[PDB]
Write a protein that holds these residues in place. Structure first.
Motif, PDB file in Angstrom:
ATOM      1  N   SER A 119      -2.004  -9.274   7.399  1.00 17.94           N
ATOM      2  CA  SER A 119      -3.235  -9.482   8.160  1.00 17.94           C
ATOM      3  C   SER A 119      -3.575 -10.975   8.182  1.00 17.94           C
ATOM      4  CB  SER A 119      -4.400  -8.632   7.582  1.00 17.94           C
ATOM      5  OG  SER A 119      -4.721  -9.001   6.238  1.00 17.94           O
ATOM      6  N   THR A 143       0.831  -1.199   0.000  1.00 22.42           N
ATOM      7  CA  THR A 143       0.000   0.000   0.000  1.00 22.42           C
ATOM      8  C   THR A 143       0.870   1.255   0.000  1.00 22.42           C
ATOM      9  OG1 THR A 143      -0.174   0.092   2.426  1.00 22.42           O
ATOM     10  CG2 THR A 143      -1.895  -1.140   1.217  1.00 22.42           C
ATOM     11  N   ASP A 156     -15.404  -5.134   9.297  1.00 24.02           N
ATOM     12  CA  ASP A 156     -14.286  -6.067   9.194  1.00 24.02           C
ATOM     13  C   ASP A 156     -14.795  -7.505   9.052  1.00 24.02           C
ATOM     14  OD1 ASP A 156     -12.673  -3.812  10.054  1.00 24.02           O
ATOM     15  OD2 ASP A 156     -12.463  -4.710  12.069  1.00 24.02           O
ATOM     16  N   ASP A 158      -3.407  -1.235  -6.380  1.00 25.87           N
ATOM     17  CA  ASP A 158      -4.815  -1.360  -6.762  1.00 25.87           C
ATOM     18  C   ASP A 158      -4.996  -2.135  -8.076  1.00 25.87           C
ATOM     19  OD1 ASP A 158      -3.555   0.922  -8.206  1.00 25.87           O
ATOM     20  OD2 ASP A 158      -5.537   1.762  -8.596  1.00 25.87           O
ATOM     21  N   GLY A 194      -8.956   1.375  11.918  1.00 23.32           N
ATOM     22  CA  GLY A 194      -8.626   0.050  11.418  1.00 23.32           C
ATOM     23  C   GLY A 194      -7.207  -0.346  11.746  1.00 23.32           C
ATOM     24  N   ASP A 195      -6.290   0.621  11.659  1.00 22.86           N
ATOM     25  CA  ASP A 195      -4.896   0.369  12.006  1.00 22.86           C
ATOM     26  C   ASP A 195      -4.775  -0.114  13.455  1.00 22.86           C
ATOM     27  OD1 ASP A 195      -1.855   0.725  11.417  1.00 22.86           O
ATOM     28  OD2 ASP A 195      -2.183   1.770  13.330  1.00 22.86           O
ATOM     29  N   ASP A 242      -9.689  -9.292   7.441  1.00 27.38           N
ATOM     30  CA  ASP A 242      -9.939  -8.309   6.422  1.00 27.38           C
ATOM     31  C   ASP A 242     -10.407  -7.026   7.105  1.00 27.38           C
ATOM     32  OD1 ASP A 242     -10.752  -6.711   4.234  1.00 27.38           O
ATOM     33  OD2 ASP A 242     -12.104  -8.206   3.384  1.00 27.38           O
ATOM     34  N   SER A 258     -11.097  -2.982   7.449  1.00 25.45           N
ATOM     35  CA  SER A 258     -11.543  -1.863   6.659  1.00 25.45           C
ATOM     36  C   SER A 258     -10.494  -0.761   6.550  1.00 25.45           C
ATOM     37  CB  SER A 258     -12.843  -1.304   7.247  1.00 25.45           C
ATOM     38  OG  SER A 258     -13.233  -0.120   6.581  1.00 25.45           O
ATOM     39  N   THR A 259     -10.422  -0.201   5.352  1.00 29.57           N
ATOM     40  CA  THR A 259      -9.565   0.939   5.087  1.00 29.57           C
ATOM     41  C   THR A 259     -10.421   2.145   4.729  1.00 29.57           C
ATOM     42  OG1 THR A 259      -9.264   0.236   2.772  1.00 29.57           O
ATOM     43  CG2 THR A 259      -7.608  -0.460   4.347  1.00 29.57           C
TER      44      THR A 259
END
Lengths: 86, 83
Positions: free
Chosen positions: B35, A11, B62, A17, B14-15, B8, B10-11
């Motif tokens: 992750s 990222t 998430d 992407d 979240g961090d 998984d 969320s972006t």
């Protein structure tokens, strides 16, 4: 057989992407995208060999990783999902 | 037993949630990708950790997936790329 494909895409570098888009497209007809970057692939061994080569070729191995887990048959992994299903 | 845990996340916040999930897994496994965690737990330990993971994530945005990889799972995993 089921192969679980986990793609850890950078990222902090450009184009991640697009690479994830291409990996997802390569997996589209042989599997299910079960999380943002995780795919459950249902394949015979020749189909796996073919798909694996494409996935290796599509990522940037200096900054991305793939992990492939051969699960045997999905029922053997007793898979559980908790939380959202986007 | 070996349980593969894929988170998984969320972006917002979240961090922090990923950090807390990694900390909860730290003594019981290896963080093999950003992750994803290979967790070695007996059933009682798994009951405990699984509850913690459920409490630490935001299930609205998430997800977690848990896979039982079985014995000799090491012969059935391939890594490609950065480590």
């Amino acid at each position: 057989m089921m192969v679980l494909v986990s793609y850890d895409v950078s990222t902090s570098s450009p184009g991640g992407d697009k690479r994830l888009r291409k990996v997802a497209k390569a997996c589209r007809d042989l599997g299910q995208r079960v999380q943002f970057s995780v795919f459950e692939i249902e394949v015979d061994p020749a189909q796996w060999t073919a798909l694996r080569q494409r996935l290796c070729d599509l990522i940037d191995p200096d900054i991305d990783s793939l992990r492939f887990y051969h699960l045997g048959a999905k029922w053997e992994a007793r898979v559980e999902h908790v939380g959202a299903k986007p």
